[PDB]
């Protein structure tokens, strides 16, 4: 259990202590903790050593526990994967025979089904590796040998079925990225070429054998074969009939069988029409035996065991697959109406299963059917296919209305600081589920508005009587009601909403107590927000709704206020017009009333809700087009926050120490959040407010920054977790947010550059440089990035001084490993990308040593394992190569200085197993660069060798570079790869596959020819 004992395991001067190897492996699996790491290091270290497999046999001969035998098998797999083409031929034959003999011996023992199945599987995988390495050429009779030996014994045949399945998986499913392209084509052609023999064996076992495990393994293999085999074996043999009759109905075989059928149903081919019909017919005739249509499949799944559940899901998959691909074939056969309906009935039953995955499988088909019927004809209460499906479309509509998922998703998420904000998750599986249910229901509502309205009226009647009254059920009904918004004509929509609102009002009046009234009040709020056309059509209705929301903003009950604010912002965005223009029966536009009453409306809201409110009002203000009226609206709009802001600025002028008061900093952060939301809504004209506070804001930023910095130097890193430092960092972040957010939406780069940028240089940038490393706010860099991206040229001239502040001192934070200060790395290369992409003359205008530093930083970027960092680094390098190619004068000097350097760095990354994610970029660059050398490059990279053209110098230089990088390569290999670099420099995916082939080659030794 000691490091020395572990080190003994790898001496190579003495016999292996299989006793000790077992102890170390048992430490690997059951070793508790601190030596576990040791034991793993030692086992990996031995496994990767060059001697490797010399002991493999010893391990297998003498060891007592399974894990150690498995470890030896790992070593054997390593040798076969990498150094097989360099073993002497007799060694390969000995390993071949050792392996198939071990496979034989293991299966014969009864215990194999028992005990270590894992070990048998690993052995079969070893043999499949040997096959992948040399199956056609060096083992030409293999398929014949094992097909014949399978008719001798049945256990041998079952294990050989597993072997054939693994070979199919390795040749046809996972060949790309593990096997070179030509060898993949070769293995596929070789398996496809000798397949009829294998299929004979399978037909024989299926039709004749009564060994249940062997039959199961054969079916499992037939699955993977269905993935790739020619259609003749599937649709021109006994196969479909044999599956449906002999295996689909018997319990232990029903899953696999059905899976196979599903795969066969996935094939989309015009020539096997009848067969497909058969496949449906027969399959249905079996399902009605095993699963009578009267069955509560919801209960059957809810109570049932694992294979029952798997069969229900496989049934959903089969019916969805077949119907989507071949519903037309059964539609045009009258003698099959009843059967088709039955299948649909099945789906409906399966749709009641409370399992969101199975339900998504069903909703896939329901959306398909609704979309097909809508594309046939989009009009209401006759086309033929819809006439076929009419007896059950109402069942489908009831399903959608009755199981509607929640429309949007909110969650309380805590930021980098302590603040828990209410974040609406934007793009999730559940929201996509809602959108699919909505699409289906909207299709079917277009097919018949009356039927949808009737189902909803019945659900809501059941709400009113108390039969189906629950917070959950009312929520679901209202979600559906909102989901069909826009599906009906505006007149039908109005009549329908009038009834809905009236009945919901009556239901409210009926129930008593805050909890019931709260649930009903939101549902009403949600429904109203979901119908903006109705609101724009009726003015008083809308005014009264808005008046109530303002009322609800004082309800202390939880969620009433939140829903009030959410509905307010939805209505404000969707009806902004109606607040700025004077309405019929009104003396002044509503915005002026709201602005006169802000302080009355928001006194009881929590800060986040106030932010939401101000954003909602900002949309209205942005709707007003006359610049002067809009200015006055903005001034009254920001009255209340500006009051507290000016109070705090004045107190700070009198005494700065109030900027260390907790509640003062909390208020400053809240005010800045309010400004940020207002700016998002209002847009460019918000400048009038921004410029009003700008300088003041920058001032407080500076001060707070310094505070945090000093607070670090006094107490180190710990101090960054205290509430006060936390709220100060919040102020800094909201300041940067407001600045970059207004700049993002500013339509005057001239004014921005001359007015708003210069104060940043000393207030934030040199302040960033002056901060202690841990105090530097990464969000500085990113904000600058945004500014650059928006300013373009109007900011080129200022690139130097900015870089004086942020560049040098940021590099030294992120050039001593690849991991610390991640936010800074990301934002830094974002800023550098912005500069290179929009202000390239600045790179041309700096000293060459500094440009060398910039280029080095780019290279440093794409060496990252942080994918986004390396990705933006490659993008920078690519657009930089093009930008250099833009001007002929410095292009040749840049090439002479950096071309080979860039090439060797990129090659260091391309051959790295940790950067494959960037392949598409790598190719795109290399291709480009190599194309550049074919023509378009005039000067010579090497002053000493001018005879040689760049292609000749590049060819031999890169070949030398790879030969010295990977010494175990062949000269022919390297020459072929280097010439392929030039040959494929205008087919980027072919170039990519060339790189992937080479990346496979650099992982295994090769001897003499490819053979």
């Amino acid at each position: 259990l000691a490091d020395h004992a572990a080190r003994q395991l790898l001496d190579f001067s003495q016999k292996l202590d299989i006793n000790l190897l077992d102890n170390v492996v048992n430490c690997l699996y059951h070793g508790e903790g601190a030596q576990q790491r040791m034991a793993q290091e030692v086992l990996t270290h031995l496994k990767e050593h060059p001697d490797a497999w010399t002991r493999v046999d010893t391990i297998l001969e003498f060891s007592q526990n399974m894990n150690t035998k498995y470890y030896g098998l790992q070593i054997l797999e390593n040798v076969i994967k990498t150094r097989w083409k360099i073993l002497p031929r007799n060694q390969c034959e000995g390993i071949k025979k050792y392996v198939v003999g071990l496979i034989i011996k293991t299966s014969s023992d009864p215990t194999c089904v028992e005990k270590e199945k894992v070990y048998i599987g690993k052995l079969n995988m070893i043999l499949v590796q040997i096959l992948k390495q040399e199956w056609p050429k060096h083992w030409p009779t293999f398929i014949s040998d094992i097909v014949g030996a399978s008719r001798t014994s049945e256990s041998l045949c079952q294990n050989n079925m597993v072997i054939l399945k693994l070979l199919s998986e390795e040749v046809f499913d996972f060949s790309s990225g593990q096997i070179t392209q030509v060898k993949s084509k070769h293995l596929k052609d070789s398996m496809c070429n000798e397949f009829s023999q294998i299929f004979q064996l399978c037909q024989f076992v299926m039709e004749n054998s009564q060994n249940a495990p062997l039959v199961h393994a054969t079916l499992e293999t037939l699955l993977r074969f269905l993935n790739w085999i020619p259609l003749g074996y599937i649709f021109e043999t006994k196969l479909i009939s044999t599956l449906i009759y002999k295996f689909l109905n018997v319990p232990m075989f029903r899953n696999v069988s059905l899976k196979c059928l599903t795969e066969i149903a996935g094939v989309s081919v015009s020539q096997y029409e009848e067969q497909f019909v058969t496949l449906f017919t027969l399959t249905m005739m079996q399902l009605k035996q095993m699963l009578p249509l009267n069955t509560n499949i919801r209960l059957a799944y809810s109570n049932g065991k694992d294979d029952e559940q798997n069969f229900i899901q496989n049934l959903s998959l089969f019916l969805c697959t077949f119907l989507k691909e071949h519903d037309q074939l059964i539609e045009k056969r009258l003698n099959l109406r009843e059967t088709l309906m039955e299948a649909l009935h099945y789906m409906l039953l399966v749709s009641e299963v409370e399992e969101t995955e199975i339900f998504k499988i069903c909703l896939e088909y329901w959306n398909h059917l609704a979309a097909e019927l809508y594309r046939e004809s989009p009009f209401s209460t006759v086309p033929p296919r819809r006439q076929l499906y009419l007896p059950m479309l109402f069942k489908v509509r009831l399903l959608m209305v009755s199981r509607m998922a929640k429309p949007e998703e909110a969650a309380a998420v805590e930021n980098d600081q302590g603040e828990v904000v209410r974040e609406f998750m934007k793009d999730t599986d559940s929201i996509n589920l809602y959108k699919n249910m909505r699409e289906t229901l909207v299709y079917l509502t277009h097919l018949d508005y009356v039927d949808t309205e009737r189902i909803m009226t019945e659900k809501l009647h059941n709400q009113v009587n108390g039969t189906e009254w629950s917070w959950k059920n009312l929520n679901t009904l209202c979600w559906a009601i909102g989901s069909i918004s826009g599906a009906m004509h505006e007149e039908d929509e109005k009549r329908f909403l009038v009834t809905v609102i009236k009945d919901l009002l009556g239901l409210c009046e009926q129930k008593r107590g805050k909890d019931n009234k709260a649930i009903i009040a939101s549902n009403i709020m949600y429904i109203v927000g979901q119908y903006p056309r109705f609101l724009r059509a009726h003015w008083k209705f809308l005014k009264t709704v808005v008046n109530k929301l303002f009322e609800f903003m004082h309800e202390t009950h939880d969620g009433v206020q939140d829903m009030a604010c959410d509905t307010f912002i939805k209505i404000a965005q969707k009806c902004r017009r109606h607040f700025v223009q004077v309405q019929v029966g009104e003396v002044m536009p509503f915005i002026d009333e709201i602005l006169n009453n802000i302080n009355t409306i928001i006194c009881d809201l929590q800060p986040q809700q106030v932010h939401t409110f101000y954003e909602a009002v900002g949309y209205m203000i942005g709707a007003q087009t006359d610049q002067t009226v809009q200015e006055h609206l903005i001034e009254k709009y920001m009255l209340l926050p500006n009051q507290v802001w000016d109070s705090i600025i004045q107190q700070a002028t009198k005494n700065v120490d109030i900027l260390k008061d907790p509640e003062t900093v909390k208020q400053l952060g809240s005010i800045l959040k309010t400004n940020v939301r207002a700016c998002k809504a209002v847009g460019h004209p918000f400048v009038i407010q921004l410029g009003r506070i700008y300088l003041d804001m920058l001032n407080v930023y500076k001060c707070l920054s310094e505070n945090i910095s000093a607070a670090i130097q006094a107490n180190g890193e710990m101090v960054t977790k205290q509430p006060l430092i936390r709220s100060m960092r919040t102020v800094k972040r909201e300041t940067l947010k407001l600045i970059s957010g207004w700049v993002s939406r500013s339509n005057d780069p001239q004014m921005v550059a001359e007015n708003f940028v210069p104060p940043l240089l000393d207030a934030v940038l040199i302040d960033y440089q002056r901060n202690v490393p841990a105090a530097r706010e990464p969000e500085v860099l990113s904000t600058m990035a945004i500014i650059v991206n928006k300013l373009g040229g109007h900011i080129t001239a200022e690139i130097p001084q900015i870089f004086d502040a942020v560049f040098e001192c940021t590099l030294n934070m992120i050039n001593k490993d690849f991991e610390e200060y991640p936010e800074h790395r990301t934002n830094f290369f974002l800023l550098l990308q912005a500069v290179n992409s929009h202000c390239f003359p600045a790179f041309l205008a700096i000293p060459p040593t500094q440009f060398k530093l910039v280029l080095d930083s780019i290279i440093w970027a794409f060496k990252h394992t942080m994918r986004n960092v390396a990705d933006t680094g490659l993008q920078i390098l690519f657009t930089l190569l093009q930008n250099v190619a833009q001007e002929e004068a410095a292009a040749q000097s840049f090439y002479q200085t950096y071309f080979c350097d860039i090439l060797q760095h990129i090659f260091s990354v391309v051959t790295d197993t940790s950067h494959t994610a960037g392949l598409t970029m790598h190719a795109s660059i290399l291709a480009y660069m190599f194309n550049l050398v074919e023509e378009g490059k005039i000067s010579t990279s090497l002053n000493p060798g001018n005879p040689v053209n760049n292609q000749i110098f590049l060819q031999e230089y890169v070949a030398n570079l790879l030969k010295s990088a990977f010494p175990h390569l062949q000269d022919a290999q390297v020459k072929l790869f280097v010439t392929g670099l030039f040959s494929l420099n205008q087919d980027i995916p072919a170039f990519k596959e060339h790189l992937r082939d080479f990346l496979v080659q650099i992982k295994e030794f090769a001897g003499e020819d490819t053979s």
Binding site: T44, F174, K259, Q313, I431, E819, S914
Partner: protein, 175 residues
């Protein structure tokens, strides 16, 4: 009641967040930086359910090919598994079948959850409509976000149900 522990094996492509996930479950900390796991680290997690506490010895493995170690081997004697990818890198999803293959070749029949991490990032690349691999492999899928706690415990909850056999188990987070 009984301290009923199970071996979980956690796999997926590099920098997918497997380790960040386990960190937040173990100490509530959210690690901001990528520090590649070498070989595997086995951390125990303990949840408390309405029917007694449950213990997951999580074998957080290394997705980087460089540092795979005994990749194949760690899967031995495992009761359950999680396969993770990154909804912001299509590559990480295209490799889900490979992790699943190498996983079920060792432990042929165990409950496996498939997780799409980083669902908080607004520029999602692996579109939610496009995750369908788990269907025919009878795997359960979730949209966790290690930073937002979106469906934070749902994978462990689902696995605890599938291992204890009570389709109504619940985490209570008792002392």
């Amino acid at each position: 009641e009984p301290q009923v522990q199970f071996k979980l094996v956690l796999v997926g492509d590099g920098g997918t967040g497997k380790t960040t996930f386990v960190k937040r479950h173990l100490t509530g900390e959210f690690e901001k930086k990528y520090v590649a796991t070498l070989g595997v680290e086995v951390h125990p997690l303990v949840f408390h359910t309405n029917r007694g506490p449950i213990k997951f010895n999580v074998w957080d493995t290394a997705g980087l090919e460089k540092f795979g170690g005994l990749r194949d081997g760690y899967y031995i004697q495992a009761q359950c598994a999680i396969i993770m990818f990154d909804v912001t890198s299509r590559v990480t999803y295209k490799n889900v079948p490979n992790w699943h293959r190498d996983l079920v070749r060792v432990c042929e029949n165990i409950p496996i959850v498939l997780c799409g991490n980083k669902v908080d990032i607004k520029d999602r690349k692996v579109k939610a409509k496009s995750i369908v691999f788990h269907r025919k492999k009878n795997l359960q899928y979730y949209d966790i976000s290690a930073k937002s706690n979106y469906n934070f415990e749902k994978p462990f909850l689902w696995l605890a149900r599938k291992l204890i056999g009570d389709p109504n188990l619940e985490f209570v987070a008792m002392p």
